Amino acid sequence: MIQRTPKIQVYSRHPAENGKSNFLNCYVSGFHPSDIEVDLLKNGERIEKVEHSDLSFSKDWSFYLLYYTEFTPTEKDEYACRVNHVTLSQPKIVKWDRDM
Amino acid sequence: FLWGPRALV
């Protein structure tokens, strides 16, 4: 079967500003099949209440999903997105860079 | 508003 690796982007809904509530997003797209595992991390630990969009797909049939959770960024709290897919030999970790 | 009729492959 035709398989595709997911593209991964971890970012905030609004521009980062320590102390103010925001939403941390992990957008995974361009993958196939649909089975995928996505976790938002806080200092290495899986985050509790994480929501996600309903499975949909693009024109090329590849799937995309948005995982998100409200959060308050701090100067020393590090966030990331851990993704695992059949195409990945090991979970892929992507760190959140407030400038991207 | 969904398309009603069913079309089997």
């Binding site: 957008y27 099949p33 049939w61 | 508003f1 398309w3 079309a7």
Partner: protein
């Protein structure tokens, strides 16, 4: 001022673990308004946009009945397809369906679609004339001939040019406080030294809707697509989208570069340059 209504359906077999997972979502442009998850507790088409909640009980029972029927159809399809491809019942397979209509700025029929894919590849698709079919492989031929015999194209054409258009029109009207908006992107540019002789110029586009947009970098008016790092358009999570484009340039040569932003919400394309 173009618009569209589109439905996306996904069915994934789970051998030894029950019926296939069935997920369906409905959209008007880039705004989701309905959803159904065979694995959810409601077992009903659910609203996902404020303006669709206006629809009465008849609407919801109707949509629920049809979405469930779509589910059953795809369940059968999965088994049929394994036979067509002489595949075993051991692996997981995916069936995807996508169909809809587009209307112009006058909200009149522009075009219709109805595509079908198996395990991520084109299986069968209705041609633009909404009268014939394009089937990839030999296996898809059977479906093509069956659908031709049953006048599936005619049935779809009536729906796509008629029903799909009228309801799309109704939705645009009922959601006239949000659905018809064209939010131009808020833009800005950042500059960061990579070294003593190279700097990164990133061009940002935020808070825009619809998601369709074009962000390019030019050097002396020359397209620099190949030198650009352009991320995929991302949803902010609040109904708007985001995107950025970056290029590394020789320090001191920034003035020769321009970022161009094209978007339906912009009365004029934007041309930005670092200052």
């Amino acid at each position: 001022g173009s618009h569209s209504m589109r439905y996306f359906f996904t069915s994934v077999s789970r051998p030894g673990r029950g019926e296939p997972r069935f997920i369906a979502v409905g959209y008007v442009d880039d705004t989701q308004f309905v959803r159904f998850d065979s694995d959810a507790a409601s077992q009903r088409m659910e609203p996902r946009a404020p303006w669709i909640e206006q629809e009465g009980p008849e609407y919801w029972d109707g949509e629920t009945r049809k979405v469930k029927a779509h589910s059953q159809t795809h369940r059968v399809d999965l088994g049929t397809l394994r036979g067509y491809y002489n595949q075993s019942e051991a692996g997981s397979h995916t069936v995807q369906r996508m169909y809809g209509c587009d209307v112009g700025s006058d909200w009149r029929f522009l075009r219709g679609y109805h595509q079908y894919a198996y395990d991520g590849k084109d299986y069968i698709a209705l041609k633009e004339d909404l009268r014939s079919w394009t089937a990839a492989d030999m296996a898809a031929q059977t479906t093509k001939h069956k659908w031709e015999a049953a006048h599936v194209a005619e049935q779809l054409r009536a729906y796509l040019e008629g029903t799909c258009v009228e309801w799309l029109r109704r939705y645009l009207e009922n959601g006239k406080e949000t659905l018809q908006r064209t939010d131009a992107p808020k833009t800005h540019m950042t500059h960061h030294a990579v070294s003593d002789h190279e700097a990164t110029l990133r061009c940002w586009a935020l808070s825009f809707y619809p998601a369709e947009i074009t962000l390019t970098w030019q050097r002396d008016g020359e397209d620099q697509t190949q030198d650009t790092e352009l991320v995929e358009t991302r949803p902010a999570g609040d109904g708007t989208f985001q995107k950025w484009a970056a290029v590394v340039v020789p320090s001191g040569q920034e003035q020769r570069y321009t970022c161009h932003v094209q978007h339906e919400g912009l009365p004029k394309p934007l041309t930005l340059r670092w200052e």
